[PDB]
Amino acid sequence: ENDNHPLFTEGTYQAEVMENSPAGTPLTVLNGPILALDADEDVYAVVTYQLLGTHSDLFVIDNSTGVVTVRSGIIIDREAFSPPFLELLLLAEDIGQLNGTAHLFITILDDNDNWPTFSPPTYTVHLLENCPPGFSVLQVTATDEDSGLNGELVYRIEAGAQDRFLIHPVTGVIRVGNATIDREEQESYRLTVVATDRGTVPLSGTAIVTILIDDINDSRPEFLNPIQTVSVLESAEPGTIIANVTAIDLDLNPKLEYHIISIVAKDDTDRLVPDQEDAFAVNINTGSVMVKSPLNRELVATYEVTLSVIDNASDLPEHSVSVPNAKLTVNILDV
Template structure:
């Protein structure tokens, strides 16, 4: 297999033939694959691990995953092979009906680098649909004095495939009165029409039975048929005519059911029953047939289902007016569905950090948000902002992604946690908005040394004190938390009259209480200087010192002595 990864310098384009399709990649974060439709679940689409520059086992280690987009996922990652595979059956006609090119998009997130890769997958058409007629049987009424060469519209066949797999030709069963002509419409469709080649005689034959066959260009060729019954009628020499060849209407998507959109009108100069006109859809796709209704007698087109601009913003139909003799006229109907602001923005947290160290630099990533609004134009334009005066900001990232980052260096001792509200508001009238709440804890770092409340301490000890007597409690405060705030007390090493300081006094390492280990004698020495150190358990530890002066108080423990006379 040929490698298919575009290197980081983005200087070239590599074409890869893979088992199920073809991959192209341009730029540094855009990957393209091509696969045929109707693949089985689990079919390989492409080697995504290699195209990301990873080994298969690194997909899980580096948190590579597909970012969901709110609908059924069509693809999945195989962590063992490192491949992108199908998650279910892929039907091109279901996904991209009528589109020349069917392209699916998904986003792949690499968690450890918080990097998004866009993947485009082209679904290629196969000949899995045969042409078919909406009406398998059709009755055409013709006047017995119809002129030879007259054209009569036949049903239009449908084939949801594209290219050569779509509808290519029509064929009429052999007969003595009719031939077939196929017109190429401006919309690219082929419209079959019946040509009267020989004059009709109702008394000779009142009905003609024909078979119309539609064929595609696939291999093998697929076909569909419709049975046509031509009824020969008595003379009616005028066909209906529409007042205009094209009817247009624009309607907001939130109109009520049963709303009248427009009226098509055709007239027939004949008198009596020969002048009566009936309306019907000659060409209408499946979606439009489920949304609109045409009144058979009045030509009123109204809604029978809710409109949704996001599902379809434009409908094209063809209506037919026919009199009792089978003469007909046709006109186009174009309906534009106008967007209203009926969808609030959607915010998806694709990556979130619940805790951040207080000494993190400005611009540290807190969360990655994907913002989307299904509406169009201004109704779909979204603005994101943060509520309140908080030390964070939003930065536009790839596509519709926003990065929530710190705007200053945080200090846990000032604010230990934040509740962040991100609001996404569209530009519609009235605007719709969505709030996303994020809780963030500021993790402590050992950035504060222990602090004594006094710059120095003094204590007084009566001489002849008992050993082990408590002299003084010295307590320091550390604003950090947990281990960073756990304080250990100790005495600086020193000597007094040749003896170590630790033989005279000691300090409780946990409480900071100073004890006398020696019974002091005022007549030997009257004060001693001690340096106390408070040290926390952080990494690295921080400490501070304070000076302590101990004064020995005299007691009346000596009787007077007579020095002279001896």
């Protein structure tokens, strides 16, 4: 009376389950329901299903209906199966222990469950100032363990760039935008850069980027006290300090030197007096200006002193002396 054994409707069943599906979630089975048929009559025609194989442990099968569901006490993770493909053996038994087989081929679908991740999370990089537009500063990289659009990453700067830095959305190369990079304008930058996936609930991971502007000595010394007039007793002896010129250089390691470059002497009748180059000296380091020759209103009533400062450490000649020069008028007073 048991002249037949069970026999599945298809020889391979193709099925898919979304990862992180909760327990009891049924398989989505693309080619009909799992079904086995035994052509005996009566009691010898009833079947009981088993599910067998390497990752059978992740599932349970109703032995009456052959429906397959996510076992409880387990979590299915697509990042733990490479390829994302599972192969299982369906077995069908009648009451005499006669068999039928078919094949369950299961694809784990992808859930956007992994964050774009920066390793390292932080970047510190030196960039020399006066760099041309488009100079590559660095490249940041993130990794997302998901795949398809869930793993594909667009880079962006959320803030800190100040319109002086741009980032290529794909490569993650950070480069210089339109504006120039002057260390004296700003000596560092902190960027919050963001890598974001394209899952339908997009996930993001961020990275701190610190950018450190190295110095070229490219900044000219500037007198803080560029015009003065001082009246000086005709009885002021040589060595007497009468004025002090001071300049400031915003580069990292200036060596400032102060020079008198002209002295122009005038009569109380306003005509030039020649060869008065030696009337005043200037301390080369402090900018302290002293009387140097003996004085007299009757010989020279006024001196126009012109004073300049040079950074010796300057890396560009064109930004190494003062503009303007310091001007000190000196006016002699009778006794």
